[PDB]
Amino acid sequence: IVEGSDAEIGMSPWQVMLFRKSPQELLCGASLISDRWVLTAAHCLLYPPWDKNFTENDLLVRIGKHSRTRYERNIEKISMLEKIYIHPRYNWRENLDRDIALMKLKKPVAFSDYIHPVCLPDRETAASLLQAGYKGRVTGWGNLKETGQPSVLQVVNLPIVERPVCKDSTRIRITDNMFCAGYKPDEGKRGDACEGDSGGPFVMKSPFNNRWYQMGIVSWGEGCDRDGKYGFYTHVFRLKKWIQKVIDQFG
């Protein structure tokens, strides 16, 4: 996260850390949606242009954390993965279209002050909140500049951007399965996600019921926090049926 700030304790209790067992390295973010299911970005797991293809036994997830590195005794929870599901239409070459994955935990996790699931958006929530200008919130332990990392979890709030602006901002082919978010050069304020923040949730607070909903997954970008450039996120409401089916089919 570039030009963000330290997170308050319990501020993003659905934040999840995708870790690799060996070598012990932090790969990405993810998010808690049930006591057994975590949602991350597909490219965190599978990215053939770098021969990345992680099995269920390659990885762990760490839930309830605040420190990036330090073991948070009696606070965090480490879980092994039962099964990984990648979106059948995920395009790792062209543009990370449908850059989404779901990971079933081997055993359900106990919620707490620091561990608690985020809601997925319905049609009404999505209609209502997915508008250019509205701000959401991105969290992660990814890098602070683009070429170090944070001591603890970082947060930033950034506005959703009009599609034509997002389209003009990159050379890359953009799908309606993704949105972009970030400040413009003339908005004064700054901020973006960066490498390592992938799979982390872009979230919005519903004025209708006070609940937080996950509208996006950190997918990609070009540099980090460059003027004229915006972070691209997986459009979660568009893929919610897949999310439903898989859960209901394999819970």
Binding site: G10, D113, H116, V118, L129, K135, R137, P159, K205
Partner: peptide, 28 residues
């Protein structure tokens, strides 16, 4: 889906984090 979206240390105590208002004020 039942308990979802409601942070134990914020919504369940009626406390706001420092900048969630920033988001809510952005809606228009």
């Amino acid at each position: 889906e039942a308990d979802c979206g409601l942070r134990p240390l914020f919504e369940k105590k009626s406390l706001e984090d420092k900048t969630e208002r920033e988001l809510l004020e952005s809606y228009i």
